[PDB]
Design an enzyme around this catalytic site. Structure first.
Site, PDB file in Angstrom:
ATOM      1  N   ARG A  86       3.107  -1.236  -1.553  1.00 28.82           N
ATOM      2  CA  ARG A  86       3.854  -0.883  -2.414  1.00 28.82           C
ATOM      3  C   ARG A  86       3.923   0.925  -2.247  1.00 28.82           C
ATOM      4  O   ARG A  86       2.874   1.688  -1.610  1.00 28.82           O
ATOM      5  CB  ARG A  86       2.707  -0.666  -3.646  1.00 28.82           C
ATOM      6  CG  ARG A  86       3.089   0.309  -4.886  1.00 28.82           C
ATOM      7  CD  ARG A  86       2.612   0.182  -6.044  1.00 28.82           C
ATOM      8  NE  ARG A  86       0.800   0.424  -5.662  1.00 28.82           N
ATOM      9  CZ  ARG A  86       0.393   1.909  -6.099  1.00 28.82           C
ATOM     10  NH1 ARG A  86       1.379   2.683  -5.640  1.00 28.82           N
ATOM     11  NH2 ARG A  86      -1.016   1.907  -5.394  1.00 28.82           N
ATOM     12  N   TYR A 234       8.169  -6.442  -0.683  1.00 31.21           N
ATOM     13  CA  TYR A 234       6.608  -6.625  -0.777  1.00 31.21           C
ATOM     14  C   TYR A 234       5.361  -5.971  -2.060  1.00 31.21           C
ATOM     15  O   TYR A 234       6.088  -5.621  -2.830  1.00 31.21           O
ATOM     16  CB  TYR A 234       6.008  -5.128   0.142  1.00 31.21           C
ATOM     17  CG  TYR A 234       4.611  -6.135   0.949  1.00 31.21           C
ATOM     18  CD1 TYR A 234       3.277  -5.087  -0.425  1.00 31.21           C
ATOM     19  CD2 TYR A 234       4.343  -6.170   2.190  1.00 31.21           C
ATOM     20  CE1 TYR A 234       1.949  -5.669   0.479  1.00 31.21           C
ATOM     21  CE2 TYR A 234       3.303  -6.769   2.194  1.00 31.21           C
ATOM     22  CZ  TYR A 234       1.658  -6.473   1.697  1.00 31.21           C
ATOM     23  OH  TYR A 234       0.715  -7.005   1.627  1.00 31.21           O
ATOM     24  N   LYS A 243       2.944  -4.146 -11.320  1.00 27.48           N
ATOM     25  CA  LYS A 243       2.670  -3.102 -11.734  1.00 27.48           C
ATOM     26  C   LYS A 243       3.473  -2.298 -12.017  1.00 27.48           C
ATOM     27  O   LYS A 243       3.936  -1.367 -13.949  1.00 27.48           O
ATOM     28  CB  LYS A 243       2.899  -2.433 -10.104  1.00 27.48           C
ATOM     29  CG  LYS A 243       1.687  -2.997  -9.452  1.00 27.48           C
ATOM     30  CD  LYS A 243       0.286  -2.653 -10.090  1.00 27.48           C
ATOM     31  CE  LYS A 243      -0.543  -3.077  -9.029  1.00 27.48           C
ATOM     32  NZ  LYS A 243      -2.133  -2.844  -9.958  1.00 27.48           N
ATOM     33  N   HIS A 263      -5.594  -0.622 -15.435  1.00 23.72           N
ATOM     34  CA  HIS A 263      -5.131  -0.555 -14.078  1.00 23.72           C
ATOM     35  C   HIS A 263      -6.602  -1.182 -14.307  1.00 23.72           C
ATOM     36  O   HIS A 263      -7.969  -0.575 -13.791  1.00 23.72           O
ATOM     37  CB  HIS A 263      -5.298   0.503 -12.738  1.00 23.72           C
ATOM     38  CG  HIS A 263      -5.319   0.127 -11.949  1.00 23.72           C
ATOM     39  ND1 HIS A 263      -5.459   0.638 -10.478  1.00 23.72           N
ATOM     40  CD2 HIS A 263      -4.897  -1.059 -11.038  1.00 23.72           C
ATOM     41  CE1 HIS A 263      -5.298  -0.305  -9.394  1.00 23.72           C
ATOM     42  NE2 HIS A 263      -5.128  -0.948  -9.780  1.00 23.72           N
ATOM     43  N   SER A 285      -6.781   1.300  -6.119  1.00 22.44           N
ATOM     44  CA  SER A 285      -6.717   0.019  -5.053  1.00 22.44           C
ATOM     45  C   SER A 285      -7.609   0.726  -4.079  1.00 22.44           C
ATOM     46  O   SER A 285      -8.230   1.904  -4.066  1.00 22.44           O
ATOM     47  CB  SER A 285      -5.599   0.164  -4.388  1.00 22.44           C
ATOM     48  OG  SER A 285      -4.646  -0.676  -3.628  1.00 22.44           O
ATOM     49  N   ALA A 286      -8.006  -0.507  -3.758  1.00 24.70           N
ATOM     50  CA  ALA A 286      -9.299  -0.326  -2.252  1.00 24.70           C
ATOM     51  C   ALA A 286     -10.780   0.271  -2.371  1.00 24.70           C
ATOM     52  O   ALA A 286     -11.431   0.359  -1.295  1.00 24.70           O
ATOM     53  CB  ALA A 286      -8.962   0.554  -1.493  1.00 24.70           C
ATOM     54  N   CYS A 287     -10.834   0.089  -4.050  1.00 26.49           N
ATOM     55  CA  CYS A 287     -12.459   0.314  -3.951  1.00 26.49           C
ATOM     56  C   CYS A 287     -13.254  -0.710  -5.274  1.00 26.49           C
ATOM     57  O   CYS A 287     -14.081  -0.079  -5.734  1.00 26.49           O
ATOM     58  CB  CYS A 287     -12.257   1.563  -5.099  1.00 26.49           C
ATOM     59  SG  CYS A 287     -11.773   3.335  -4.391  1.00 26.49           S
ATOM     60  N   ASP A 310      -7.224  -6.890 -12.079  1.00 28.49           N
ATOM     61  CA  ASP A 310      -6.614  -5.758 -12.047  1.00 28.49           C
ATOM     62  C   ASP A 310      -5.540  -4.984 -12.864  1.00 28.49           C
ATOM     63  O   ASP A 310      -5.493  -3.977 -12.734  1.00 28.49           O
ATOM     64  CB  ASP A 310      -5.590  -6.214 -10.836  1.00 28.49           C
ATOM     65  CG  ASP A 310      -4.393  -5.213 -10.026  1.00 28.49           C
ATOM     66  OD1 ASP A 310      -4.887  -4.638  -9.406  1.00 28.49           O
ATOM     67  OD2 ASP A 310      -2.887  -4.781 -10.344  1.00 28.49           O
ATOM     68  N   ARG A 404      -2.535  -9.142   2.016  1.00 29.30           N
ATOM     69  CA  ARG A 404      -3.125  -9.694   1.111  1.00 29.30           C
ATOM     70  C   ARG A 404      -2.781 -11.507   0.553  1.00 29.30           C
ATOM     71  O   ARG A 404      -2.029 -12.376   1.312  1.00 29.30           O
ATOM     72  CB  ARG A 404      -1.605  -9.320  -0.002  1.00 29.30           C
ATOM     73  CG  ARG A 404      -1.798  -7.836  -0.260  1.00 29.30           C
ATOM     74  CD  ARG A 404      -2.662  -7.531  -1.661  1.00 29.30           C
ATOM     75  NE  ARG A 404      -2.418  -6.203  -1.701  1.00 29.30           N
ATOM     76  CZ  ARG A 404      -3.500  -4.775  -2.392  1.00 29.30           C
ATOM     77  NH1 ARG A 404      -3.947  -6.221  -3.144  1.00 29.30           N
ATOM     78  NH2 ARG A 404      -3.928  -4.070  -2.389  1.00 29.30           N
TER      79      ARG A 404
END
Ligand code: GTP
Ligand code: SPV
Ligand code: MN
Ligand code: MN
Ligand code: NA
Length: 613
Positions: A86, A234, A243, A263, A285-287, A310, A404
């Protein structure tokens, strides 16, 4: 006859379904865009298993995906390395007035959105879409965000020239004929997507992955109920339900209509007494949202069940319960770092009927990535996501860091029994958090709703330096962030609202050597136990300037005697003085005239409490 030639009738090019079957406004959307984009074929998706099989066969025969022979009906796509995530810089919202989309930043550089004028967008659109699907199939994906027919659900129609998008939307949304039938003549979000590579190709195709990086543009026109995306195949750029619709468009609808689009994961947690509560959590994201949503708790007698990992849509019901639904139908989760240790329930979910993007492939037809924590037999080799042979000492990773899996939610061994309940599940706590290597303790509880909204507003997380990511929504606000804060604050004035307790977590605090202070993953069950008891009104909290924290001995640390409790739970006056200094500068620069008074007051209150240390 209603035309002098053949009108704008594309019936001759239909290879699945019938244009005559579509609701009138759906047909108008399809035919208008067929005229513009000039696809060779039109495929009206029915969502059937038969269709899905043929779609996967087509992609396999075209070399777009490969079958992973080690598993049951699993598939691998490898992308052009220019199209791997993204992409915020190419993501815009169009409104008549810029300030409706984003506050005007004093510095001239907004971190809270990216507005584009209607005029600029029309020029961009005309430079991209005319003829863009030449030689390709336009697939028509009728999809529902939310359980089919739920009062909280919303329907879209996505037109795409990507069969990868069709397959992935089948997993991530409810799609097919049943949706068209539920829709009838009602309203729908118009979603248009193209990879931006009409045939014959003007530029070389890389890894059989059609994309147009230079012209990539992901646009949202909320006043027309349209999402228009070009050039990327993607994830959040192309799967427009996720999103673009369920956060950006939906957050603005939510503000107008009295609900919330966030989110947030949603989980159900049951204690050893059999008492169950649902919680929502917003992390960037990524947490680690996906790890928490699917947690295998280490504490005996506890259980966690997943509603979603999500996105959450939340609305107060007639009784004052904040009810949440997961509008998605699957999980689109980061693969690297997923292991039996970090997410055992994900490992079980993804071994059948799953599409993997940009992971490595083992010589026996399995998948591989950094952090999988499963040794391979001597002799088994690895092909990277770049389609090259790879060994562990190599400089670069075998999987892209944002690679993913895309997997059905119904397959999750701990999917909550109310994960598709149309009324949603009653949320009793909301958790904020991200990556803070210093200063912020493992867990604290907000003093009030207004303090809680401030805690969400002040969120910061390390990703190329510590950056602000309020509510984990920085890339996703559908409208002015100041007005979003006012909307959250207004929930307190809803008569008889049962306002969730708000907490903030930090899994990521480090000691001076860079070592994590807390083991995390399933051990986070010890933190959820504390939150659960707090919602029950247990006297397990100590007041501090930042909110309540666990009392000494309040957390179950049995099994974790080597935890440095002093450092993990420490609160430094100097750290917090700097923190309030920084938050003040950020809100003034980025939100300014759109900042609600109550957020300014909470900042002052926090500053004042710190002063008394
Ligand atoms: N130290 C530590 N790391 C964690 C924990 N939970 C998750 N992580 C890390 O978080 C990352 C995985 O989170 P992601 O799946 O990228 O995050 P997400 O919130 O689901 O992201 P999106 O799907 O992009 O919204 C990996 O780096 C994990 O090691 C934890 O309890 N402790
Ligand atoms: O970036 C995120 O928060 C994601 O969940 C992945 S994507 O759907 O935006 O690709
Ligand atoms: Mn995730
Ligand atoms: Mn996300
Ligand atoms: Na490929």
């Amino acid at each position: 006859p209603p035309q002098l030639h053949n009108g704008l009738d594309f019936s001759a090019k239909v290879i699945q379904g019938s244009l005559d079957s579509l609701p009138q406004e759906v047909r108008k959307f399809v035919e208008g865009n067929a005229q513009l984009c000039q696809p060779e074929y039109i495929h009206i998706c029915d969502g059937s298993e038969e269709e899905y099989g043929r779609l996967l066969a087509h992609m396999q025969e075209e070399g777009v995906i490969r079958k992973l022979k080690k598993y049951d009906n699993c598939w691998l796509a490898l992308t052009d390395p220019r199209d791997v995530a993204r992409i915020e810089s190419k993501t815009v919202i169009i409104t008549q007035e810029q300030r409706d989309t984003v506050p005007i930043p004093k510095s001239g550089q907004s971190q809270l959105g990216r507005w584009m004028s209607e005029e600029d967008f029309e020029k961009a659109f005309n430079a991209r879409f005319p003829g863009c699907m030449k030689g390709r199939t336009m697939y028509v994906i009728p999809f529902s965000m939310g359980p089919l027919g739920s009062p909280l659900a919303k329907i879209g129609i996505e037109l795409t020239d990507s069969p990868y998008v069709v397959a992935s939307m089948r997993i991530m949304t409810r799609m097919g004929t049943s949706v068209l039938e539920a829709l009838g003549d009602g309203e729908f979000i118009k979603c248009l997507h193209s990879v931006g590579c009409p045939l014959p190709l003007k530029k070389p195709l890389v890894n059989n992955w059609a994309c147009n990086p230079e012209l990539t543009l992901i646009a949202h026109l909320p006043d027309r109920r349209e999402i228009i995306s070009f050039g990327s195949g993607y994830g959040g750029n192309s799967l427009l339900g996720k999103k673009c619709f369920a956060l950006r468009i939906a957050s603005r609808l939510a503000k107008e209509e009295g609900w919330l689009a966030e989110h947030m994961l949603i989980l159900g947690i049951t204690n050893p007494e059999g008492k169950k509560k649902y919680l929502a959590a917003a992390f960037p994201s990524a947490c680690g949202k996906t790890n928490l949503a699917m947690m295998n708790p280490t504490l005996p007698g506890w259980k966690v069940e997943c509603v979603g990992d999500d996105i959450a849509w939340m609305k107060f019901d007639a009784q004052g319960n904040l009810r949440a639904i997961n509008p998605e139908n699957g999980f689109f989760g980061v693969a690297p770092g997923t292991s039996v240790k970090t997410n055992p329930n994900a490992i079980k979910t993804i071994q059948k009927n799953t599409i993997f993007t940009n992971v490595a492939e083992t010589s026996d037809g399995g998948v591989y990535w950094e952090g999988i924590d499963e040794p391979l037999a001597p002799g088994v080799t690895i092909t990277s996501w770049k389609n090259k042979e790879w060994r562990p000492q190599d400089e670069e990773p075998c999987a892209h860091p944002n690679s993913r899996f895309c997997t059905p939610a119904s397959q999750c061994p701990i999917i909550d029994p109310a994960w598709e309940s149309p009324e949603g599940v009653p949320i009793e706590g909301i958790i904020f958090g991200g990556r803070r290597p210093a200063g912020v303790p493992l867990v604290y509880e907000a003093l009030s709703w207004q303090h809680g909204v401030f805690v969400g507003a002040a969120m910061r997380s390390e990703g190329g330096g510590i950056m602000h990511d309020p509510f984990a929504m920085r890339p996703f606000f559908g409208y002015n962030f100041g007005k979003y804060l006012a909307h959250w604050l207004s929930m307190a004035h809803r008569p008889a609202a049962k306002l969730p307790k708000i907490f903030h977590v930090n899994w990521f605090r480090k000691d001076k050597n860079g070592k994590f202070l807390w083991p995390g993953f399933g051990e986070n069950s010890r933190v959820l136990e504390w939150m659960f008891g707090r919602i029950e009104g247990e006297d397990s909290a100590k007041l501090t300037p930042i909110g309540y924290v666990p009392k000494e001995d309040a957390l179950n640390l049995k099994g974790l005697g080597d935890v440095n409790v002093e450092e993990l739970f420490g609160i430094s006056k100097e750290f917090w003085e700097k923190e309030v200094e920084e938050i003040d500068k950020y809100l003034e620069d980025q939100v300014n005239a759109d900042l609600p008074y109550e957020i300014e007051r909470e900042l002052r209150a926090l500053k004042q409490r710190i002063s008394q240390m």
